[PDB]
């Protein structure tokens, strides 16, 4: 279940371990894009929210 | 007209001119060539 066209999918993630690498590496997505660098490079970095 | 390297395995040494254009693995996919998903052509 995802946000309808009248809402944006904005789900806060906090106080947790972010497996950014698996999100990039996984074949379950049809496509992946990133503004900066790949999630496998972001894999051990800390973020606000 | 002009192409620039965006995807490279490692950083260059001063005054190095490395011009191989082979398509290669970025992510989890065990390939070379086969551009798509997680293998890419190095220049744009």
Curated annotation (Swiss-Prot), chain A:
* Outcome of mutating residue 31 to A: In strain: Omicron/BA.2, Omicron/BA.2.12.1, Omicron/BA.4, Omicron/BA.5, Omicron/BQ.1.1, Omicron/XBB.1.5, Omicron/EG.5.1
Impact reported for residue 26 to F: In strain: Omicron/BA.2, Omicron/BA.2.12.1, Omicron/BA.2.75, Omicron/BA.4, Omicron/BA.5, Omicron/BQ.1.1, Omicron/XBB.1.5, Omicron/EG.5.1
Look up the domain of life of the source.
Viruses
Q: How does it assemble?
A: Binds to host ACE2. RBD also interacts with the N-linked glycan on 'Asn-90' of ACE2. Cleavage of S generates a polybasic C-terminal sequence on S1 that binds to host Neuropilin-1 (NRP1) and Neuropilin-2 (NRP2) receptors. Interacts with host integrin alpha-5/beta-1 (ITGA5:ITGB1) and with ACE2 in complex with integrin alpha-5/beta-1 (ITGA5:ITGB1). May interact via cytoplasmic c-terminus with M protein. May interact (via N-terminus) with host bilirubin and biliverdin, thereby preventing antibody binding to the SARS-CoV-2 spike NTD via an allosteric mechanism.
Its job:
Attaches the virion to the cell membrane by interacting with host receptor, initiating the infection. The major receptor is host ACE2. When S2/S2' has been cleaved, binding to the receptor triggers direct fusion at the cell membrane. When S2/S2' has not been cleaved, binding to the receptor results in internalization of the virus by endocytosis using host TFRC and GRM2 and leading to fusion of the virion membrane with the host endosomal membrane. Alternatively, may use NRP1/NRP2 and integrin as entry receptors.
Q: What is this protein called?
A: Spike protein S1
The lineage, from the top, is: Viruses, Riboviria, Orthornavirae, Pisuviricota, Pisoniviricetes
Gene that encodes it: S
Query: Which part of the complete protein is shown?
Result: 346 to 394 of 1273
């Amino acid at each position: 279940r995802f946000a309808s066209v009248y809402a944006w999918n904005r789900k806060r993630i906090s106080n947790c371990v972010a497996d950014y690498s698996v999100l990039y590496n996984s074949a379950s997505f049809s496509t992946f894009k990133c503004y900066g660098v790949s999630p496998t490079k972001l894999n051990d970095l800390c973020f606000t929210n | 007209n002009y192409l620039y390297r965006l995807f490279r395995k490692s950083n260059l040494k001063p005054f190095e001119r490395d011009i191989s254009t082979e398509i290669y693995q970025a992510g989890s996919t065990p390939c070379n060539g086969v551009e798509g998903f997680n293998c890419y052509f190095p220049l744009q």
